[PDB]
């Protein structure tokens, strides 16, 4: 017994026509006068565009005229003008209507792509359906004898026609006749008939339109809407405040041109009531109707026709339309340019203190007036605005444990935005953790971060729990860390081992802590010699809990005191004992999968403190005799263009092709500057000498240069290479090479030649740079726009079907192996082993149970894994099917948002790919999502058989194939273009080569299977990435696939339609629900059919999500036509509708209003 | 054939949708805004099915099809004008003829002319008012007394009836006249109709009897006796229905009565007016369709002045249309030019007003473009820019006047402007609002109501609602020092006694102090 009459709870939205008595439903008046404003009072006129008594009240409370005044009659309205006195913001509420004289054609309704009112009608649109309205050729309305029932009359065939008959199939012409059309046609009857005729003795040459509008015919009439509406007679208003004219400053209004529109619409409607009453000259009368329709259409949606232009702006008018078809500000915000802080822990960043100060205002204020010091609330305002000292503390305590999350400007993935705990700083800027520093790609040119205050409870907890930095040490895309060590502390750690012999060397033994005051102390030095102590390690194992194992090791100086830092567990020592490189981010992996989470953190604090404060001891320089070079450049590069100079000499007496020796040559100054290359690079990397004990040994330079090479912090071998070797072979504009590469280099001087000939290399770099960053982004949203709406749910299903993971392996013509591909990867079922039992069946390959995975040995290379390309779930994603990999080490927590942290992973790494039988690049990725036919794609064989010849070149033709065995033939098409690859009488498999060339993606699905595509594309996406030499794990790509095999199609006999491509979700859902209903027989068996990002994003249940990216006068239409309604699940339209995310915080929120609603 | 293989073949897919392409490869009148949404709206999105309902599909504007009308020349001369307008004047006296053959139409218009008299020379209406009076009162006689059997005594009464032709009313009178008898014959054939429908349709009579019978005499019950009478099958239904034919005619002879004239006869005069009535709206229809040129011709010189060209010339067009009402043939003046002045206030009288968003008066526009004709003279008739003081100085108007009539000019701008051309800005973007109040003052007011709530309680009953009622708070209405006198015995000064000492009591707390600032 509900039933409630309220502003209350909505579970979903319907959209609909709208009757001209549901547009009165809304009326709060009808507007009559184009007036707006008053010339001289400026105050609302009577029954204009702005009225007072129809819409709402100028000031608040007060009326028009002004009898009443206060709060005193907020319920009754004035006496002398109707003006119900509540709000100014009922006028931001109020509707409105119009009530035109002759019909009018809605423009979406009449010209959007399909013509609906035509379709459904069946009549052509700017053809027939335009000079039947426009007044120029009547049309019929239904006629027993001669006439049919929709033909086109002129008015001598119509006057022809009246006289033979008449008086018995009277048909209008214009607005009001389309709607006695609409009117008079029987949705019902004709979808009976239609079904009758468009079934009869008719093969493939009809069953196109026949299936079309049958289905679209019965769609209209269940949708509850009644044609007659698609042309209204009732035209509704736009609340005023939508569309306001308000004085700006000194006079000089500023309105919106609906008000233009609006005036339009009112004036030439009037003048054609006023002419439906007058002397009605037809000629007269029907240009006047076109006239109002001329300014309706304008006023809903220009578009389209000319553009409706005035206003004195040579610039056309914004529609209603046009205001809602193709970023959201908020309060309690900020922003500065941030700066390095590297006293600052992990979990904190500096916060400035006029900054916070204004940011939490409104804590301080509450703060304040609780604790006493002011009176009242404004008693804080005035005490803050005069910054009074105690404020500073009161401050210091609600910025306590309040997290700030911050932002950077190219949000590519998760680590954008991650929270911190305020640390209030004397200073203007915005102070950063150099470790996150790398998560946000972030630099200190200038760069600027904004700050978000976390207002309400839980998104404080949200604040905390998720995004906080120490929960993000692993990055989502690949397992390894994120907040790994970079330049400045990596050189330090690289410069804490290094061993070097003897100076201030010897072995003097004794016991950790104790060396660090045997450094401080001078007498020895640091990087020698090496020496030995006593190493104290621990380790656990079975039963874990900790082991010692104290020992003599031979360490040097730095690796004995950086194992003060290293934690409790791990192996020790041979941590240390390598050096500081990548391993120095293997160390804090192993560390995080060994310990936990807070022990692996605060090491990252420790070795960030150790690195920057012995680098900073150092003093790692870099003089101009930093970067020597060999001393063999002279000799190599006039050697190079010695040979050079015997093939231009050979060209010259003929001999060699000259049309390709400028390839010969190149490879000779290409090996030349692999030649001077090679030897700036073994001539720095080794050298020195030394002398230990009895002189004369070689280890490796301590040049500086080199040792920020050999330790990441920006130093790569091509850098380097033109520091001091030589700038190589060079780019021209053309696209080709010049023959003269840059001998010189850096060290040296540069010609002001070939300076102008480097500007080419960097002008196409910077730009080339400009373009793949947009089109990055472009390729993200894409990813998401698709991708965004799954989310892990209904726990772990059954099922044990996975692709077969195994080994990508190159190696079979390169050698290159790479299998870590499983971890964290969720077992299929019990895959084997070389004798016995072993692993489980649902058991997750743990990151030390997949090294356990090497202990079979290198036998097992092959394993069934449960991915989200197969799992039989619903309409989500089965945990177990998914993995783990997160910034979190378990499996993903239910209810996660796998979709956009995928898309993130995939579109991130966009940044650094190069764009161009190998494309390569980021063009690469998009043509393989899009599941694009390549330019010469190759042919297979459907049905394995025996190929044979089917009539040399008889059509048409074109060379046949045909592969018949067992029963039925096949008859493929060759085009004699490009050859073959078996000859006739041999015999194919299903699904065989027969063109051994580029495939394609629909066919290999199509035929070959599901695994076979998704691990084509799997394995053929990284293989881009590769190159690039970006990780990213393979479980995304997955992600993506699974839902770009969304939707299938039907052949044979269901409760489903036949042609009809529907998605396995209802498909799946609906046979299973057959099988044991009914009878299975009513229904058919599906089949899995591959569309790309965009084709399979454009298909989704919203029709507010989709009103989101596609096109919004498109969709908005065509949903509106059929009674279609949201309700309500997914990410982004509910995000506009702005409510909880159903999923993550939410998820449980939606879940128990999902169940909700199905009392009804 | 051309258009679809062209479309199909070429577009495989044109890779980056080369769109300028078969644009050109399209026929008809080229550079449009029309078909070009309906090329973007195929080749993506719904591919490969799209392209097979795209030619489907194809298996405009305003003015040029105005003009297409309009085409329709039918032009006319001296001769051709003159015979319309024959002919409207020849429609016009038949249906006021058939108006003065109505006698309650002469008998009302007596009867409102002493209502007139009751409360153009006084003495000239009484004249003329009784010339009709005496005309009808000698004519009225003539009818009972049957002396000349409707022959002479029909003379007499076409006398009255040249008589009221004498009398040129107005506009308002002849058309409620006209309607009051329309509405009058409504309820007679609303009567012929009750009759018809109850027995021919009730009462199984078939339409050749009825025709037959009621055709007579129509009021008198010697044809609906005489039908029942005739034993004939659908005689016997009539019996159900005598009640309803008796109550139709007796309220049929009961208009008999009303218009004091033969029932057989007044669908005669009637009919006549009707007829009038059609052939001349007919010619003046003839007559503004002839014409229409005239209306575009001149509405082109005023176009551009903040009303499109549809509007202008349409206003002409109903300017044209009441030109055609005021004017007759014999009149040596042409109407080539008398509808053309008609035009020009009616399209002038229209761009005065209904083209600003804003309201204006006449005299404003008229004031307005004086000031711009005066003002083009002065910066060229010297050399530098006209001062306001000076332009004011060459007018009546002093100068303030002309300051604030600027402040009415421009339409003027809209929010939808580009300012910054950022991504992308709109002057109505940057409009702040104002009739919002902050939240941080939305919250002071409400502490305040919790500090004014809070400190009433430090005081006394016949002291918190004294301060409480004077100044009007939580109670809405506030009252004055009687009406609060009043409802405490002691009255004025006693009061304010206490009035005062509350207030003195508010001089140590500090929440009220600091609320105030
Ligand atoms: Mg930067
Ligand atoms: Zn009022
Ligand atoms: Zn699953």
Same mark, same amino acid.
């Given at each position: +017994?509900?039933?409630?009459?309220?502003?209350?709870?909505?579970? =979903?939205?319907?959209?609909?026509?709208?009757?001209?008595?549901?547009?009165?439903?809304?009326?709060?008046?009808?507007?009559?006068?184009?007036?707006?404003?008053?010339?001289?009072?400026?105050?609302?006129?009577?029954?204009?565009?702005?009225?007072?008594?129809?819409?709402?009240?100028?000031?608040?409370?007060?009326?028009?005229?002004?009898?009443?005044?206060?709060?005193?009659?907020?319920?009754?309205?004035?006496?002398?003008?109707?003006?119900?006195?509540?709000?100014?913001?009922?006028?931001?509420?109020?509707?409105?209507?119009?009530?035109?004289?002759?019909?009018?054609?809605?423009?979406?309704?009449?010209?959007?792509?399909?013509?609906?009112?035509?379709?459904?009608?069946?009549?052509?649109?700017?053809?027939?359906?335009?000079?039947?309205?426009?007044?120029?050729?009547?049309?019929?309305?239904?006629?027993?004898?001669?006439?049919?029932?929709?033909?086109?009359?002129?008015?001598?065939?119509? +006057?022809?026609?009246?006289?033979?008959?008449?008086?018995?199939?009277?048909?209008?012409?214009?607005?009001?006749?389309?709607?006695?059309?609409?009117?008079?046609?029987?949705?019902?009857?004709?979808?009976?008939?239609?079904?009758?005729?468009?079934?009869?003795?008719?093969?493939?040459?009809?069953?196109?339109?026949?299936?079309?509008?049958?289905?679209?015919?019965?769609?209209?009439?269940?949708?509850?809407?009644?044609?007659?509406?698609?042309?209204?007679?009732?035209?509704?208003?736009?609340?005023?405040?939508?569309?306001?004219?308000?004085?700006?400053?000194?006079?000089?209004?500023?309105?919106?041109?609906?008000?233009?529109?609006?005036?339009? %619409?009112?004036?030439?409607?009037?003048?054609?009531?006023?002419?439906?009453?007058?002397?009605?000259?037809?000629?007269?009368?029907?240009?006047?109707?076109?006239?109002?329709?001329?300014?309706?259409?304008?006023?809903?949606?220009?578009?389209?026709?000319?553009?409706?232009?005035?206003?004195?702006?040579?610039?056309?008018?914004?529609?209603?339309?046009?205001?809602?078809?193709?970023?959201?500000?908020?309060?309690?915000?900020?922003?500065?340019?941030?700066?390095?802080?590297?006293?600052?822990?992990?979990?904190?960043?500096?916060?400035?203190?006029?900054?916070?100060?204004?940011?939490?205002?409104?804590?301080?204020?509450?703060?304040?007036?609780?604790?006493?010091?002011?009176?009242?609330?404004?008693?804080?305002?005035?005490?803050?605005?005069?910054?009074?000292?105690?404020?500073?503390?009161?401050?210091?305590?609600?910025?306590?444990?309040?997290?700030?999350?911050?932002?950077?400007?190219?949000?590519?993935?998760?680590?954008?935005?991650?929270?911190?705990?305020?640390?209030?700083?004397?200073?203007?800027?915005?102070?950063?953790?150099? +470790?996150?520093?790398?998560?946000?790609?972030?630099?200190?040119?200038?760069?600027?971060?904004?700050?978000?205050?976390?207002?309400?409870?839980?998104?404080?907890?949200?604040?905390?729990?998720?995004?906080?930095?120490?929960?993000?040490?692993?990055?989502?895309?690949?397992?390894?860390?994120?907040?790994?060590?970079? !330049?400045?502390?990596?050189?330090?750690?690289?410069?804490?081992?290094?061993?070097?012999?003897?100076?201030?060397?010897?072995?003097?033994?004794?016991?950790?802590?104790?060396?660090?005051?045997?450094?401080?102390?001078?007498?020895?030095?640091?990087?020698?010699?090496?020496?030995?102590?006593?190493?104290?390690?621990?380790?656990?194992?079975?039963?874990?809990?900790?082991?010692?194992?104290?020992?003599?090791?031979?360490?040097?100086?730095?690796?004995?005191?950086?194992?003060?830092?290293?934690?409790?567990?791990?192996?020790?020592?041979?941590?240390?004992?390598?050096?500081?490189?990548?391993?120095?981010?293997?160390?804090?992996?192993?560390?995080?999968?060994?310990?936990?989470?807070?022990?692996?953190?605060?090491?990252?604090?420790?070795?960030?403190?150790?690195?920057?404060?012995?680098?900073?001891?150092?003093?790692?320089?870099?003089?101009?005799?930093?970067?020597?070079?060999?001393?063999?450049?002279?000799?190599?590069?006039?050697?190079?263009?010695?040979?050079?100079?015997?093939? !231009?000499?050979?060209?010259?007496?003929?001999?060699?092709?000259?049309?390709?020796?400028?390839?010969?040559?190149?490879?000779?100054?290409?090996? =030349?500057?692999?030649?001077?290359?090679?030897?700036?690079?073994?001539?720095?990397?080794?050298?020195?000498?030394?002398?230990?004990?009895?002189?004369?040994?070689?280890?490796?330079?301590?040049?500086?240069?080199?040792?920020?090479?050999?330790?990441?912090?920006?130093?790569?071998?091509?850098?380097?290479?033109?520091?001091?070797?030589?700038?190589?072979?060079?780019?021209?504009?053309?696209?080709?090479?010049?023959?003269?590469?840059?001998?010189?280099?850096?060290?040296?001087?540069?010609?002001?030649?070939?300076?102008?000939?480097?500007?080419?290399?960097?002008?196409?770099?910077?730009?080339?740079?400009?373009?793949?960053?947009?089109?990055?982004?472009?390729?993200?949203?894409?990813?998401?726009?698709?991708?965004?709406?799954?989310?892990?749910?209904?726990?772990?299903?059954?099922?044990?079907?996975?692709?077969?993971?195994?080994?990508?392996?190159?190696?079979?013509?390169?050698?290159?192996?790479?299998?870590?591909?499983?971890?964290?990867?969720?077992?299929?079922?019990?895959?084997?082993?070389?004798?016995? =039992?072993?692993?489980?069946?649902?058991?997750?390959?743990?990151?030390?149970?997949?090294?356990?995975?090497?202990?079979?040995?290198?036998? %097992?290379?092959?394993?069934?894994?449960?991915?989200?390309?197969?799992? #039989?779930?619903?309409?989500?994603?089965?945990?177990?099917?998914?993995?783990?990999?997160?910034?979190?080490?378990?499996?993903?927590?239910?209810?996660?948002?796998?979709?956009?942290?995928?898309?993130?992973?995939?579109?991130?790494?966009?940044?650094?790919?190069?764009?161009?039988?190998?494309?390569?690049?980021?063009?690469?990725?998009?043509?393989?999502?899009?599941?694009?036919?390549?330019?010469?794609?190759?042919?297979?064989?459907?049905?394995?058989?025996?190929?044979?010849?089917?009539?040399?070149?008889?059509?048409?033709?074109?060379?046949?194939?045909?592969?018949?065995?067992?029963?039925?033939?096949?008859?493929?098409?060759?085009?004699?273009?490009?050859?073959?690859?078996?000859?006739?009488?041999?015999?194919?498999?299903?699904?065989?080569?027969?063109?051994?060339?580029?495939?394609?993606?629909?066919?290999?699905?199509?035929?070959?299977?599901?695994?076979?595509?998704?691990?084509?594309?799997?394995?053929?996406?990284?293989?881009?990435?590769?190159?690039?030499?970006?990780?990213?794990?393979?479980?995304?790509?997955?992600?993506?696939?699974?839902?770009?095999?969304?939707?299938?199609?039907?052949?044979?006999?269901?409760?489903?339609?036949?042609?009809?491509?529907?998605?396995?979700?209802?498909?799946?859902?609906?046979?299973?629900?057959?099988?044991?209903?009914?009878?299975?027989?009513?229904?058919?068996?599906?089949?899995?059919?591959?569309?790309?990002?965009?084709?399979?994003?454009?298909?989704?249940?919203?029709?507010?999500?989709?009103?989101?990216?596609?096109?919004?006068?498109?969709?908005?239409?065509?949903?509106?036509?059929?009674?279609?309604?949201?309700?309500?699940?997914?990410?982004?339209?509910?995000?506009?509708?702005?409510?909880?995310?159903?999923?993550?915080?939410?998820?449980?929120?939606?879940?128990?209003?999902?169940?909700?609603?199905?009392?009804? | 054939?051309?258009?679809?293989?062209?479309?199909?073949?070429?577009?495989?897919?044109?890779?980056?949708?080369?769109?300028?392409?078969?644009?050109?490869?399209?026929?008809?009148?080229?550079?449009?805004?029309?078909?070009?949404?309906?090329?973007?709206?195929?080749?993506?999105?719904?591919?490969? !099915?799209?392209?097979?309902?795209?030619?489907?599909?194809?298996?405009?504007?305003?003015?040029?099809?105005?003009?297409?009308?309009?085409?329709?020349?039918?032009?006319?001369?001296?001769?051709?004008?003159?015979?319309?307008?024959?002919?409207?004047? #020849?429609?016009?006296?038949?249906?006021?003829?058939?108006?003065?053959?109505?006698?309650?139409?002469?008998?009302?218009?007596?009867?409102?002319?002493?209502?007139?008299?009751?409360?153009?020379?006084?003495?000239?209406?009484?004249?003329?008012?009784?010339?009709?009076?005496?005309?009808?009162?000698?004519?009225?006689?003539?009818?009972?007394?049957?002396?000349?059997?409707?022959?002479?005594?029909?003379?007499?009464?076409?006398?009255?009836?040249?008589?009221?032709?004498?009398?040129?009313?107005?506009?308002?009178?002849?058309?409620?006249?006209?309607?009051?008898?329309?509405? $009058?014959?409504?309820?007679?054939?609303?009567?012929?109709?009750?009759?018809?429908?109850?027995?021919?349709?009730?009462?199984?009579?078939?339409?050749?009897?009825?025709?037959?019978?009621?055709?007579?005499?129509?009021?008198?019950?010697?044809?609906?006796?005489?039908?029942?009478?005739?034993?004939?099958?659908?005689?016997?239904?009539?019996?159900?229905?005598?009640?309803?034919?008796?109550?139709?005619?007796?309220?049929?002879?009961?208009?008999?009565?009303?218009?004091?004239?033969?029932?057989?006869?007044?669908?005669?005069?009637?009919?006549?007016?009707?007829?009038?009535?059609?052939?001349?709206?007919?010619?003046?229809?003839?007559?503004?369709?002839?014409?229409?040129?005239?209306?575009?011709?001149?509405?082109?010189?005023?176009?551009?002045?903040?009303?499109?060209?549809?509007?202008?010339?349409?206003?002409?067009?109903?300017?044209?249309?009441? =030109?055609?009402?005021?004017?007759?043939?014999?009149?040596?003046?042409?109407?080539?030019?008398?509808?053309?002045?008609?035009?020009?206030?009616?399209?002038?009288?229209?761009?005065?007003? !209904?083209?600003?968003?804003?309201?204006?008066?006449?005299? $404003?526009?008229?004031?307005?473009?004086?000031?711009?004709?005066?003002?083009?003279?002065?910066?060229?008739?010297?050399?530098?820019?006209?001062?306001?003081?000076?332009?004011?100085?060459?007018?009546?108007?002093?100068?303030?006047?002309?300051?604030?009539?600027?402040?009415?000019?421009?339409?003027?701008?809209?929010?939808?402007?580009?300012?910054?051309?950022?991504?992308?800005?709109?002057?109505?973007?940057?409009?702040?609002?104002?009739?919002?109040?902050?939240?941080?003052?939305?919250?002071?007011?409400?502490?305040?109501?919790?500090?004014?709530?809070?400190?009433?309680?430090?005081?006394?009953?016949?002291?918190?609602?004294?301060?409480?009622?004077?100044?009007?708070?939580?109670?809405?209405?506030?009252?004055?020092?009687?009406?609060?006198?009043?409802?405490?015995?002691?009255?004025?000064?006693?009061?304010?006694?206490?009035?005062?000492?509350?207030?003195?009591?508010?001089?140590?707390?500090?929440?009220?102090?600091?609320?105030?600032?």
């Amino acid at each position: +017994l509900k039933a409630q009459t309220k502003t209350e709870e909505f579970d =979903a939205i319907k959209i609909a026509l709208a009757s001209p008595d549901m547009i009165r439903s809304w009326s709060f008046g009808e507007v009559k006068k184009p007036e707006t404003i008053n010339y001289r009072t400026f105050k609302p006129e009577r029954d204009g565009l702005f009225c007072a008594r129809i819409f709402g009240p100028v000031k608040d409370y007060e009326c028009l005229c002004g009898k009443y005044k206060r709060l005193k009659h907020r319920g009754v309205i004035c006496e002398k003008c109707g003006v119900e006195v509540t709000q100014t913001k009922v006028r931001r509420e109020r509707m409105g209507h119009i009530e035109l004289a002759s019909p009018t054609a809605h423009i979406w309704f009449l010209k959007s792509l399909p013509s609906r009112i035509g379709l459904l009608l069946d009549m052509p649109l700017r053809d027939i359906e335009r000079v039947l309205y426009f007044e120029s050729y009547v049309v019929i309305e239904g006629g027993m004898t001669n006439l049919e029932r929709q033909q086109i009359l002129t008015e001598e065939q119509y +006057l022809d026609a009246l006289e033979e008959f008449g008086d018995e199939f009277d048909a209008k012409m214009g607005a009001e006749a389309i709607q006695a059309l609409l009117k008079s046609m029987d949705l019902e009857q004709e979808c009976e008939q239609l079904r009758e005729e468009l079934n009869e003795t008719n093969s493939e040459t009809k069953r196109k339109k026949l299936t079309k509008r049958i289905k679209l015919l019965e769609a209209f009439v269940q949708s509850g809407n009644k044609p007659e509406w698609m042309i209204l007679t009732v035209l509704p208003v736009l609340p005023p405040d939508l569309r306001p004219l308000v004085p700006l400053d000194g006079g000089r209004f500023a309105t919106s041109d609906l008000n233009d529109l609006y005036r339009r %619409v009112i004036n030439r409607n009037n003048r054609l009531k006023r002419l439906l009453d007058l002397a009605a000259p037809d000629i007269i009368v029907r240009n006047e109707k076109r006239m109002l329709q001329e300014a309706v259409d304008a006023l809903l949606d220009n578009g389209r026709r000319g553009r409706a232009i005035t206003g004195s702006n040579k610039r056309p008018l914004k529609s209603l339309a046009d205001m809602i078809k193709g970023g959201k500000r908020v309060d309690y915000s900020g922003r500065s340019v941030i700066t390095v802080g590297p006293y600052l822990r992990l979990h904190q960043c500096g916060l400035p203190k006029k900054m916070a100060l204004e940011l939490f205002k409104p804590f301080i204020y509450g703060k304040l007036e609780l604790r006493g010091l002011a009176t009242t609330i404004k008693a804080a305002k005035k005490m803050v605005e005069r910054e009074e000292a105690v404020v500073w503390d009161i401050l210091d305590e609600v910025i306590r444990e309040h997290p700030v999350l911050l932002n950077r400007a190219p949000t590519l993935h998760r680590l954008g935005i991650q929270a911190f705990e305020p640390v209030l700083i004397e200073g203007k800027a915005i102070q950063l953790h150099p +470790l996150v520093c790398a998560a946000y790609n972030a630099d200190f040119d200038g760069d600027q971060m904004a700050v978000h205050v976390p207002l309400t409870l839980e998104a404080q907890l949200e604040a905390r729990a998720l995004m906080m930095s120490t929960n993000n040490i692993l990055s989502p895309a690949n397992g390894e860390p994120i907040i790994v060590p970079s !330049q400045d502390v990596v050189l330090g750690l690289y410069y804490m081992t290094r061993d070097c012999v003897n100076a201030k060397g010897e072995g003097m033994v004794l016991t950790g802590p104790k060396e660090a005051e045997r450094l401080y102390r001078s007498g020895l030095a640091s990087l020698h010699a090496r020496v030995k102590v006593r190493i104290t390690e621990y380790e656990k194992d079975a039963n874990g809990e900790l082991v010692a194992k104290t020992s003599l090791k031979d360490t040097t100086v730095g690796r004995a005191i950086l194992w003060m830092i290293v934690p409790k567990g791990l192996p020790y020592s041979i941590v240390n004992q390598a050096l500081g490189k990548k391993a120095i981010s293997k160390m804090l992996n192993t560390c995080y999968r060994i310990l936990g989470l807070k022990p692996t953190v605060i090491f990252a604090d420790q070795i960030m403190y150790t690195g920057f404060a012995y680098a900073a001891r150092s003093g790692a320089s870099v003089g101009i005799d930093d970067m020597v070079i060999p001393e063999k450049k002279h000799e190599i590069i006039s050697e190079a263009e010695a040979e050079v100079a015997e093939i !231009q000499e050979q060209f010259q007496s003929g001999l060699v092709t000259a049309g390709e020796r400028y390839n010969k040559v190149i490879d000779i100054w290409a090996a =030349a500057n692999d030649r001077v290359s090679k030897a700036m690079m073994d001539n720095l990397q080794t050298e020195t000498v030394i002398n230990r004990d009895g002189q004369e040994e070689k280890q490796v330079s301590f040049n500086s240069i080199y040792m920020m090479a050999d330790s990441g912090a920006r130093g790569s071998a091509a850098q380097i290479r033109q520091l001091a070797g030589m700038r190589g072979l060079m780019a021209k504009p053309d696209g080709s090479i010049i023959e003269t590469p840059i001998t010189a280099n850096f060290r040296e001087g540069l010609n002001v030649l070939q300076y102008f000939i480097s500007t080419h290399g960097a002008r196409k770099g910077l730009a080339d740079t400009a373009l793949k960053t947009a089109n990055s982004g472009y390729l993200t949203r894409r990813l998401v726009d698709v991708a965004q709406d799954l989310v892990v749910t209904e726990d772990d299903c059954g099922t044990h079907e996975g692709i077969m993971m195994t080994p990508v392996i190159e190696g079979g013509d390169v050698k290159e192996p790479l299998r870590d591909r499983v971890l964290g990867r969720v077992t299929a079922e019990d895959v084997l082993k070389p004798g016995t =039992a072993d692993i489980l069946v649902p058991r997750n390959t743990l990151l030390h149970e997949q090294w356990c995975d090497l202990l079979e040995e290198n036998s %097992v290379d092959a394993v069934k894994v449960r991915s989200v390309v197969s799992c #039989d779930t619903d309409f989500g994603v089965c945990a177990h099917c998914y993995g783990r990999d997160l910034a979190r080490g378990h499996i993903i927590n239910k209810g996660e948002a796998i979709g956009v942290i995928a898309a993130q992973s995939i579109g991130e790494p966009g940044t650094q790919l190069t764009m161009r039988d190998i494309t390569g690049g980021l063009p690469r990725v998009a043509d393989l999502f899009e599941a694009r036919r390549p330019k010469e794609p190759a042919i297979l064989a459907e049905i394995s058989g025996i190929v044979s010849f089917g009539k040399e070149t008889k059509g048409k033709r074109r060379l046949v194939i045909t592969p018949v065995d067992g029963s039925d033939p096949y008859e493929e098409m060759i085009p004699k273009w490009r050859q073959l690859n078996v000859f006739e009488g041999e015999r194919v498999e299903r699904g065989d080569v027969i063109s051994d060339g580029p495939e394609a993606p629909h066919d290999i699905l199509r035929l070959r299977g599901v695994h076979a595509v998704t691990r084509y594309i799997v394995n053929e996406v990284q293989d881009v990435y590769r190159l690039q030499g970006v990780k990213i794990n393979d479980k995304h790509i997955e992600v993506i696939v699974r839902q770009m095999l969304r939707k299938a199609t039907i052949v044979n006999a269901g409760s489903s339609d036949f042609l009809e491509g529907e998605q396995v979700e209802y498909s799946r859902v609906k046979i299973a629900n057959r099988e044991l209903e009914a009878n299975g027989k009513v229904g058919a068996t599906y089949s899995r059919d591959l569309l790309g990002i965009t084709k399979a994003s454009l298909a989704t249940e919203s029709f507010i999500s989709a009103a989101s990216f596609q096109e919004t006068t498109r969709v908005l239409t065509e949903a509106a036509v059929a009674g279609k309604r949201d309700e309500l699940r997914g990410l982004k339209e509910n995000v506009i509708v702005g409510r909880l995310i159903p999923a993550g915080t939410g998820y449980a929120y939606h879940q128990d209003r999902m169940r909700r609603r199905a009392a009804g | 054939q051309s258009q679809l293989k062209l479309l199909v073949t070429r577009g495989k897919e044109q890779g980056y949708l080369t769109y300028a392409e078969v644009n050109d490869h399209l026929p008809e009148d080229i550079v449009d805004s029309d078909q070009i949404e309906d090329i973007i709206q195929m080749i993506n999105d719904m591919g490969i !099915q799209v392209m097979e309902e795209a030619p489907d599909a194809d298996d405009t504007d305003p003015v040029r099809m105005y003009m297409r009308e309009m085409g329709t020349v039918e032009l006319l001369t001296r001769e051709g004008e003159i015979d319309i307008a024959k002919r409207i004047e #020849d429609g016009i006296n038949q249906v006021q003829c058939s108006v003065a053959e109505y006698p309650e139409a002469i008998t009302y218009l007596l009867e409102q002319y002493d209502r007139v008299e009751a409360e153009i020379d006084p003495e000239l209406a009484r004249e003329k008012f009784a010339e009709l009076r005496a005309q009808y009162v000698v004519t009225r006689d003539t009818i009972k007394a049957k002396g000349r059997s409707h022959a002479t005594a029909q003379e007499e009464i076409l006398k009255l009836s040249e008589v009221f032709k004498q009398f040129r009313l107005v506009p308002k009178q002849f058309d409620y006249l006209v309607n009051s008898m329309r509405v $009058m014959m409504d309820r007679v054939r609303t009567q012929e109709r009750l009759i018809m429908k109850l027995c021919v349709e009730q009462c199984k009579m078939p339409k050749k009897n009825f025709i037959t019978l009621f055709t007579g005499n129509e009021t008198s019950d010697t044809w609906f006796n005489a039908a029942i009478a005739m034993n004939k099958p659908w005689s016997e239904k009539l019996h159900d229905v005598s009640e309803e034919v008796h109550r139709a005619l007796q309220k049929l002879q009961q208009i008999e009565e009303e218009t004091g004239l033969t029932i057989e006869q007044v669908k005669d005069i009637n009919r006549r007016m009707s007829i009038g009535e059609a052939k001349a709206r007919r010619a003046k229809k003839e007559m503004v369709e002839a014409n229409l040129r005239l209306v575009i011709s001149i509405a082109k010189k005023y176009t551009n002045r903040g009303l499109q060209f549809l509007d202008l010339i349409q206003e002409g067009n109903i300017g044209l249309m009441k =030109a055609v009402d005021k004017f007759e043939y014999r009149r040596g003046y042409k109407f080539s030019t008398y509808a053309t002045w008609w035009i020009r206030q009616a399209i002038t009288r229209s761009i005065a007003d !209904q083209a600003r968003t804003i309201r204006i008066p006449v005299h $404003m526009i008229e004031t307005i473009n004086k000031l711009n004709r005066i003002s083009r003279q002065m910066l060229q008739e010297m050399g530098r820019e006209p001062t306001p003081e000076e332009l004011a100085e060459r007018m009546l108007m002093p100068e303030d006047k002309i300051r604030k009539v600027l402040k009415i000019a421009k339409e003027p701008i809209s929010m939808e402007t580009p300012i910054g051309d950022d991504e992308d800005s709109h002057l109505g973007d940057f409009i702040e609002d104002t009739t919002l109040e902050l939240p941080l003052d939305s919250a002071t007011t409400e502490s305040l109501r919790a500090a004014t709530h809070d400190v009433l309680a430090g005081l006394t009953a016949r002291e918190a609602k004294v301060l409480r009622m004077r100044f009007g708070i939580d109670m809405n209405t506030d009252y004055t020092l009687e009406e609060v006198g009043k409802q405490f015995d002691v009255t004025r000064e006693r009061i304010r006694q206490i009035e005062a000492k509350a207030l003195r009591k508010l001089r140590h707390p500090s929440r009220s102090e600091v609320l105030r600032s």
